[PDB]
Amino acid sequence: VGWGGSLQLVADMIKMFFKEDWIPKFSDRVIFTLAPMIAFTSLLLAFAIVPVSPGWVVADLNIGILFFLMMAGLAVYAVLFAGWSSNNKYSLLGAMRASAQTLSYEVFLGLSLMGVVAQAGSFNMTDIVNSQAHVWNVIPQFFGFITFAIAGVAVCHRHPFDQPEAEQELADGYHIEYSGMKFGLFFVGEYIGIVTISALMVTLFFGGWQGPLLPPFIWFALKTAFFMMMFILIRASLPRPRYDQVMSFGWKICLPLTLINLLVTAAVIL
Amino acid sequence: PAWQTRDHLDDPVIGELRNRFGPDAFTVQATRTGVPVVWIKREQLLEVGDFLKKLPKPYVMLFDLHGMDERLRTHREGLPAADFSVFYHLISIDRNRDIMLKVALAENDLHVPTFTKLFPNANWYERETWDLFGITFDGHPNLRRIMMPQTWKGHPLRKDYPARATEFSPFELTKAKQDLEMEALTFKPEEWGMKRGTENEDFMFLNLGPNHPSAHGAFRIVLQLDGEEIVDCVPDIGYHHRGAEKMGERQSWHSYIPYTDRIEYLGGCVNEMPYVLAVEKLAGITVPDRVNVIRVMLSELFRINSHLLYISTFIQDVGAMTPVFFAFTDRQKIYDLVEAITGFRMHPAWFRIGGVAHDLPRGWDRLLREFLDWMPKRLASYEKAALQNTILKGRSQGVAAYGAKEALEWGTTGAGLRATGIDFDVRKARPYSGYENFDFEIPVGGGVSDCYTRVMLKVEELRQSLRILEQCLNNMPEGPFKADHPLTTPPPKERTLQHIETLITHFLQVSWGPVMPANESFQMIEATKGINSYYLTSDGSTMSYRTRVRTPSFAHLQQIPAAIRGSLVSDLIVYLGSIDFVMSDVDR
Amino acid sequence: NDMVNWGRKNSIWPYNFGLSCCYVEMVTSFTAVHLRASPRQADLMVVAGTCFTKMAPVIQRLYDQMLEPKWVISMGACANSGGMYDIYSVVQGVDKFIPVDVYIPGCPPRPEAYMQALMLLQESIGKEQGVYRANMQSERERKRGERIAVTNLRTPDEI
Amino acid sequence: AFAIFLIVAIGLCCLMLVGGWFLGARLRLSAKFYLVAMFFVIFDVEALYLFAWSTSIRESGWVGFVEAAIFIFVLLAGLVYLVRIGALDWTP
Ligand code: SF4
């Protein structure tokens, strides 16, 4: 039997290849093609700002944080042009409610990231990875860390669980009208999304490239693997939350939490 | 005996109707239904029913309305000359009595005034009579075909209609292309019921056919929407029609028993109990006490399983499904006991006329005792998890509620009707299968029937069923598992393997069938959902002449349009989940 | 190389079309083996339950919607044939109007039968419909000498 | 650099898409109530000032914390206003 966890996803990709493509009638054609890469390329290029090595850095640009927020905001357009390209009021309203809770729960990550970039004081990722040299920026900011966790898992990572189905009748999940390679493109996109959120979390919250007794790149890789397993553990443990309860625990509870979080970090940093 | 042929002429209702109308018109039939069967010409039916409706203790609920062919009955002594008949079974709860009314019709003039004005739940019943027979009910609002498609020529319950598919042309897809063209051109002519609203921007037509889980079968409910309101909901039923009633005519009394198990997939031996009780009423068989206790044990086990499925699914759809999935493991244990007794997990087909198929295997008591001691702690964990929860409780209050009168007019029985203040169980009012030797209580909801009240009552009934099952474990008596009577089918097998006369009885009983003399029997039981009954008529042969299966889910699904009018689509879906309806039961 | 064949054996997407009855055992199997199954995304359709003349166009539209590589598992006697319901209102098998690949007798079949259905279907999927001049061997013929050699069974008066 | 990685990514996109091709009126009550998203459109603009703020706070000091507290207090007053009037509530 197959011994590797990734080989199942590999076979899934093989399966999506060589499948006949049908044209949709009474549909727009340019967005039907362009909507997959708005979901894929965003979290693909979210990987372009990680300091995997000082000598093998993929991009030595001055700002990486703002690019990450730009991808966070950009992701919504994939659910919107997918909703309009569904060309069925059912599916369109399903994607409208999915984009609703998406825009609703994407607010928190930037304000949660303000704490770590304020105690770091720079946008160049070399400064952040050199800041976590002895003390990581997770001990004081527990609330900011969990708020960024909720926000990162809330951006189309399936934790809300309103993507392929709809609690509300008169509408339907928006993953139905795509059946060619685009559905595999969606899955591989969320896969690079979860691994890139984990990598950004480890290299921005915890200390990357430390190397206590072993070479630091495999130290980063193993820590990323532990956070991968913990993310999968809590994603599976996380039950489906209906639309209402998600709206209830959104703007009410965590906007004050992040505002007092910014107050606490600004009071303690000086 | 409880099987002897009675006329019931002495019953007070018969004498009140005799006083009111004097002599003539009424012919009191002799049957083993247990109820008074009266013939009433079709020109006085509406008058007669009205008198019964307003009588000082009225017959508030129309239990059943259907027709009989009656053309091929050779033994017709005492009945008037009829080519067709329509029977109306009515029940007075305050009298705890029943009455059956039979209107005779001739083959050239199949016309009778509609009865829906008195009882609204008769509307679908009359539609079924138009569909399966060819009686036209003049004055019916929407007299269309409710079971077969709208182009189906022929009335399938007539005896000149060949029953089996083999007599028709096989699925050559000549008609599949026409059904494809019809389905592709899905348009609304506004003939699907009243459809007062016009098809424009003001009103939106939505099939809203739930194929998702917890739908309890795939069905369509065409809905007219205005302001996200249910202007008119029209179910399109009949997709799961299996022709069980027609199947009863071409099968022997013994070989039909498997077909009973599939009227309701979750019922199992509950569905078999009324059939065997009616057949033994035709045979005149009194079973031993051990047969009664065994049947009570299997029926309470299946009732517990069905109630646990209803609770689990209810908590899953409108609540937290993490803990109640442990009931799935518990349901497996109830199943390992059923296949320990009967043999197979679902559709046991284990009940026989006069007894059961085998004796209990010798290790049944220890398994049942281990399940009965282990279960109560879990049952109390579910009781705390469901009585004390707040989120679904707040959600599940006042959601499409109805009262006693509303349930009565809509024929609704079971947990729906018990949620109101009417204390009416059939296991106490009309004891059957030895329930009168057991101690159990009937929980009641008060005066408001909603989704929380129904589940709380089902939990209380499940606790009383567990008390019945412990009384079955502690008071199971000793003796035979089959009655001693020549119509007990089959005979005890060890007797068959050694004795020539028992071998001959077994030979003719399993091959030609047992010969039941020409008479009519009727039994109703409390089922897992509502009240389920079987009205069997034998013409003296080894097969049924007429088999009528009254399923409560048909009435429960008929009731939704009266209560859901003035609600949202979400309230509709929640109500559909709450109501105890299964498509197999609605379409038999 | 046959890497493409390996891709389809390793991973399959099931579309559960179980009807009124016969689906409680299928659910028993599915909740142990496995919201992922979606219309117009699956390549496997496990038709269960009694196929009726009235709702057969629904099954034909769902069959048409799926992609070019189509697999169908019939489970139960009610889906393989008409089963016990040889009546005017039931079509005598889902194989009358859609091609079927695997037949799983029973009423209802067991979850282990579903497991053996996936094993026989990956076996057919790994030989390329999958005849390949290897499928003439039949389960009636393969385990015949296994089944005939059985002599003693437990007496039915015990648990 | 970033340009090389972008060229690699767009070349991979062209390779996958080309390979894929070779392989072969009235809404009434429905929708509406996007005003949570309009609240986001305005609140992202409010939080962009904190986006510019987060780079330089050590040289800002006590008056900086004071008027940042005033700013987020104004935002909090607006938020509780929208909550208490019923604008920010359950939404379809
Ligand atoms: S195979 Fe058995 S369980 Fe399935 S539908 Fe047919 S009779 Fe019911």
UniProtKB/Swiss-Prot annotation, chain A:
Disulfide pairings: none
Q: Which GO terms describe its cellular component?
A: membrane; NADH dehydrogenase complex; plasma membrane; respiratory chain complex I
Transmembrane regions:
30-50, 63-83, 103-123, 135-155, 186-206, 214-234, 253-270
GO terms, molecular function = oxidoreductase activity, acting on NAD(P)H, quinone or similar compound as acceptor; quinone binding
Report the enzyme's class at the first EC level: translocase
Which reactions is this enzyme annotated as catalysing?
a quinone + NADH + 5 H(+)(in) = a quinol + NAD(+) + 4 H(+)(out)
Q: Does the entry feature the keyword Kinase, yes or no?
A: no
Bilayer topology reads: Multi-pass membrane protein
Give the family from UniProt: Belongs to the complex I subunit 1 family.
This molecule's function is given as: NDH-1 shuttles electrons from NADH, via FMN and iron-sulfur (Fe-S) centers, to quinones in the respiratory chain. The immediate electron acceptor for the enzyme in this species is believed to be ubiquinone. Couples the redox reaction to proton translocation (for every two electrons transferred, four hydrogen ions are translocated across the cytoplasmic membrane), and thus conserves the redox energy in a proton gradient. This subunit may bind ubiquinone.
Quaternary structure and interacting proteins, as annotated: NDH-1 is composed of 13 different subunits. Subunits NuoA, H, J, K, L, M, N constitute the membrane sector of the complex.
Name-wise, this protein is NADH-quinone oxidoreductase subunit H
Q: Which residues of the full protein are shown?
A: 52 to 321 of 325
UniProtKB/Swiss-Prot annotation, chain B:
One MF term in GO for this entry? NADH dehydrogenase (ubiquinone) activity
Supply one GO CC term from the record: plasma membrane
Q: Which domain of life is it from?
A: Bacteria
Q: Where is this region: NADH dehydrogenase I subunit D?
A: 202-588
Q: Where is this region: NADH dehydrogenase I subunit C?
A: 1-178
Top EC group: translocase
EC number(s) of the enzyme? 7.1.1.-
**What are the subcellular locations of this protein?**
Cytoplasm; Cell inner membrane
Enumerate the Gene Ontology biological process terms: respiratory electron transport chain
Q: Which SUPFAM superfamilies match?
A: HydB/Nqo4-like (SSF56762), Nqo5-like (SSF143243)
Keyword field: Cell inner membrane, Cell membrane, Cytoplasm, Membrane, Multifunctional enzyme, NAD, Quinone, Translocase, Transport, Ubiquinone
What is its membrane topology?
Peripheral membrane protein
- Matches recorded under InterPro entries: NADH_DH_suC, NADH_DH_suCD, NADH_Q_OxRdtase_suD, NADH_quin_OxRdtase_su_C/D-like, NADH_UbQ_OxRdtase_30kDa_su, NADH_UbQ_OxRdtase_49kDa_CS, NADH_UbQ_OxRdtase_CS, NDH1_su_D/H
Q: Which reaction does it catalyse?
A: a quinone + NADH + 5 H(+)(in) = a quinol + NAD(+) + 4 H(+)(out)
Q: According to its UniProt record, which protein family does this protein belong to?
A: In the N-terminal section; belongs to the complex I 30 kDa subunit family.
Q: What does this protein do?
A: NDH-1 shuttles electrons from NADH, via FMN and iron-sulfur (Fe-S) centers, to quinones in the respiratory chain. The immediate electron acceptor for the enzyme in this species is believed to be ubiquinone. Couples the redox reaction to proton translocation (for every two electrons transferred, four hydrogen ions are translocated across the cytoplasmic membrane), and thus conserves the redox energy in a proton gradient.
Q: Which HAMAP family match?
A: NDH1_NuoC (MF_01357), NDH1_NuoCD_1 (MF_01359), NDH1_NuoD (MF_01358)
Return the protein name. Answer: NADH-quinone oxidoreductase subunit C/D
Supply the gene name: nuoC
Curated annotation (Swiss-Prot), chain C:
In the record, what terms sit under GO molecular function?
Answer: 4 iron, 4 sulfur cluster binding; iron ion binding; NADH dehydrogenase (ubiquinone) activity; NADH:ubiquinone reductase (non-electrogenic) activity; quinone binding
Q: Which cofactor does it need?
A: [4Fe-4S] cluster
What are the EC numbers?
A: 7.1.1.-
Cofactor annotation comment: Binds 1 [4Fe-4S] cluster.
Q: Which reaction does it catalyse?
A: a quinone + NADH + 5 H(+)(in) = a quinol + NAD(+) + 4 H(+)(out)
Q: Could you list this entry's UniProt keywords, alphabetically sorted.
A: 4Fe-4S, Cell inner membrane, Cell membrane, Iron, Iron-sulfur, Membrane, Metal-binding, NAD, Quinone, Translocase, Transport, Ubiquinone
Please give, as recorded in its UniProt entry, the membrane topology of this protein.
Peripheral membrane protein
Output the GO biological process annotations, alphabetical, semicolon-separated. Answer: aerobic respiration; electron transport coupled proton transport; respiratory electron transport chain
Where's it found, cell-wise?
Cell inner membrane
Task of the protein: NDH-1 shuttles electrons from NADH, via FMN and iron-sulfur (Fe-S) centers, to quinones in the respiratory chain. The immediate electron acceptor for the enzyme in this species is ubiquinone. Couples the redox reaction to proton translocation (for every two electrons transferred, four hydrogen ions are translocated across the cytoplasmic membrane), and thus conserves the redox energy in a proton gradient.
Family membership? Belongs to the complex I 20 kDa subunit family.
Q: What is this protein called?
A: NADH-quinone oxidoreductase subunit B
Question: Which species?
Answer: Escherichia coli (strain K12)
Its encoding gene is what? nuoB
Swiss-Prot record, chain D:
Main subcellular localisation: membrane
Parts of the chain that traverse the membrane? 2-22, 33-53, 63-83
Q: Name one GO cellular component term.
A: NADH dehydrogenase complex
Top-level enzyme category: translocase
Tell whether Cell inner membrane is among the UniProt keywords.
Answer: yes
Keyword DNA damage listed:
no
Its annotated compartments are: Cell inner membrane
E.C. number:
7.1.1.-
Example of a GO biological process term: respiratory electron transport chain
Top-level taxon in the UniProt lineage: Bacteria
Q: How does it sit in the membrane?
A: Multi-pass membrane protein
**Name of the protein in question:** NADH-quinone oxidoreductase subunit A
Identify the species of origin: Escherichia coli (strain K12)
Full-protein interval shown: 15 to 127 of 147
